[PDB]
Structure formats: C-alpha cells, structure tokens
C-alpha cells in the first residue's frame, strides 16, 4: 500500500502540481504544501536545543530513511546518537506542535552506510533509523515506496521531474509550513560540468538550467528529505533520491545533488531484514 496517499490517490483526488510531473514523463522558490501532500515526510528533531535537524522519509511502520551527513559529518563536528534526536511524523507546520496529528517517535538504532564518504564528496549519503515502536498510519502519515530496478530505469531520465519537500531555509527565512518544489533531473554530463566536486554513480542532480527560466532547489535543513516521483504505470509515489548536497542554494549554473536510492537498495534491504 506504499505510495498511495490517503487524502489524494486513495480518494482519487490530485494535488495541484502532480500533473507537471506526469507531463514531464515523455526549499528555495517552492510553495506551501497541501495538507497530506507528502504523508511520508519526516522531521528529524534535535532534543537539546530543540531545533530542526534534517528531513527524512517514512518507508515502513518502523523504518525512516535519511541522509548520512544528517547524523555524521566530522567537518562540522556532527556525530548524533540515538538519544540525541526525535522523529516527528505527519507534520505540516514547522515549529508548532500539531496536537492530534503528528506523532513523535524515539530512535532505537541508527545505521549509516559503511562506505559513506564524508571526507570527500558525500558519496553514499544514506542512513536508516529504526523506531522504538511502530507508528500508526493515518491521513497524514503514510509510507512512500522504494524503487525497483524497472522503476528506476524508466523514471530516472534527464528532463523527468521529481518532487522535493522540506522545512529548510527559503534562501541561501524559515518557512511556516512544509515547502514543495518540482525539479527536472539533469543529464550526467551537465551535472559533472557544473562543479569541481567528483560525482559518482550513487548520485544524480536536478534543477533548472539558467536558460529554462524557472528555478528552485533544496537548502539548509532539507538534507535527508525525499526526492519523489509518481509512477505513471501504477500511480504510486516512489522515493528516487535523498536530498544530499549542493554549492549554495538555487544558484544559476548549479544543481542540487541527490543520493541515488535504487543504487543503494541492496544495502537498505540487507539492513532491514537483518536487524529489523
């Protein structure tokens, strides 16, 4: 039942911008999300001080996916442990405690990819978090699907648009509610030629070119959030990427880089059936 939103797909209602994604299958400069628009959106909340740590996504009733650099990044003296964080699911407003809607869960264990490269280019920027107890689904809490080889092959194409969501900065400016922006995947050569950072097959970039007029990008605090696409085949939402890195936010000639979820699914599966 993953990837089918209670307030949209389940009722045969479409959100205001999913058509844009579909037409292409042939947060800075974003907008307020609709209620229940991204039921898999997870907020990584730091206990002390109480603040936004990163975004994340719900992939099952007990597992949450995020970016490794959200939990471990020595250059900025970041090395969070289970008890340092909380997971807030079903939220819309950034700072308000949404009584009777959101669910706050504690972490049981954190799993960071063994070959995550924080020293150089954030290669394999991915991590799993197992919750102490199952989260109850609702109109505002629902898991997104993980792509299989076929889904990745057909949707991960230059030009095809995905959707990024988060409570991160609005400019390189804190949002009142969850923000959303649809961005086109960019050809590998263009991604490579836009930066001096070494790009790997475990990442893909997205965003508009300067000549395309439109813009948008993820920013500080959006890391760990999902880059999703709605399959035109079975109408389910799939998380194809994880907000990973970028040089600044929404700069012309630059693009956002996302962890290639399918490429690391082997690891995800391994961890889930081994420890969970």
């Amino acid at each position: 039942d993953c990837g089918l939103r209670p307030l949209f797909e389940k009722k045969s209602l479409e959100d205001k911008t999913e058509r844009e994604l579909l037409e292409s299958y042939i947060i800075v400069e974003g907008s307020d999300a609709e209620i229940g628009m991204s039921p898999w959106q997870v907020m990584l909340f730091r206990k002390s001080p109480q603040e936004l740590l990163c975004g994340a996504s719900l992939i099952s009733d007990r597992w949450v996916l995020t970016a490794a650099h959200c939990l471990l990044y020595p250059p900025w003296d970041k090395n969070f442990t289970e008890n340092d964080l909380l997971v807030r699911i079903g939220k819309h407003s950034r700072t308000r405690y949404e009584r009777n809607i959101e669910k706050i869960s504690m972490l049981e264990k954190i799993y960071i990819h063994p070959r995550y490269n924080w020293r150089e280019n954030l290669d394999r920027d991915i991590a799993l978090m197992k919750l102490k107890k199952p989260v109850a689904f609702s109109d505002y809490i629902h898991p997104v699907c993980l792509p299989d080889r076929e889904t990745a092959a057909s949707l991960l194409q230059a030009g095809y648009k995905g959707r990024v969501t988060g409570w991160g900065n609005l400019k390189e400016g804190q949002p009142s509610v969850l923000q959303v922006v649809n961005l086109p995947i960019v050809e590998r050569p263009v991604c490579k030629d836009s930066t001096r950072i070494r790009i790997t097959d475990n990442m893909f970039c997205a965003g508009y070119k300067p000549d395309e007029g439109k813009r948008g990008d993820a920013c500080e605090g959006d890391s760990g959030g999902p880059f999703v696409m709605k399959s035109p085949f079975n109408n389910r939402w799939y998380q194809m990427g994880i907000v990973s890195w970028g040089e600044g936010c929404d700069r012309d000639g630059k693009y956002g880089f996302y962890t290639h979820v399918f490429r690391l699914k082997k690891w995800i599966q391994k961890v889930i059936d081994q420890f969970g």
Binding site: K47, Q50, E51, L52, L86, T95, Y97, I104
Partner: peptide, 11 residues
Amino acid sequence: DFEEIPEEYLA
C-alpha cells in the same frame, strides 16, 4: 522558536 513538545517524548 519551536513550540514545546510534551514531556512524555523528551523523557
């Protein structure tokens, strides 16, 4: 500027 969350989760 974050609203105080229940103590049950902080404990």
